[PDB]
């Protein structure tokens, strides 16, 4: 068993705006918020979780150095 289909989804520019509208209000999605945003954009919980992971990995975090993925 495992992930039947998995990669970095080539999502649409307007669809990424909706992801950033969700991100702007809350940086972390739980299973309800993630599935809700998924079905609204016809995405999967996986694809949405990969996106919110990457944006928090690409944003300026307080470490030894600025984490810009």
Curated annotation (Swiss-Prot):
Protein name per the record: Homeobox protein Nkx-3.1
Chain segments annotated as coiled-coil in the UniProt record: none
Ranges of the DNA-binding region feature: 12-63
Family that this chain belongs to: Belongs to the NK-3 homeobox family.
Disulphide linkage map: none
Entry's localization field: Nucleus
Induction or repression: By androgens and, in the LNCaP cell line, by estrogens. Androgenic control may be lost in prostate cancer cells during tumor progression from an androgen-dependent to an androgen-independent phase.
Subunit structure: Interacts with serum response factor (SRF). Interacts with SPDEF. Interacts with WDR77. Interacts with TOPORS which polyubiquitinates NKX3-1 and induces its proteasomal degradation. Interacts with FEM1B.
Job description of the protein: Transcription factor, which binds preferentially the consensus sequence 5'-TAAGT[AG]-3' and can behave as a transcriptional repressor. Plays an important role in normal prostate development, regulating proliferation of glandular epithelium and in the formation of ducts in prostate. Acts as a tumor suppressor controlling prostate carcinogenesis, as shown by the ability to inhibit proliferation and invasion activities of PC-3 prostate cancer cells.
Gene: NKX3-1
PTM summary: Ubiquitinated by TOPORS; monoubiquitinated at several residues and also polyubiquitinated on single residues.
Tissue expression summary: Highly expressed in the prostate and, at a lower level, in the testis.
Protein source organism: Homo sapiens (Human)
């Amino acid at each position: 068993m495992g992930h039947h289909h998995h990669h970095h989804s080539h999502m649409s520019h307007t669809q990424v705006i909706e992801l950033e509208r969700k991100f702007s209000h809350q940086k972390y999605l739980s299973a309800p918020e993630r599935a809700h945003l998924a079905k609204n954009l016809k995405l999967t919980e996986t694809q949405v979780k990969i996106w919110f992971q990457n944006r928090r990995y690409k944003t300026k975090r307080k470490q030894l150095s600025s984490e810009l993925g």
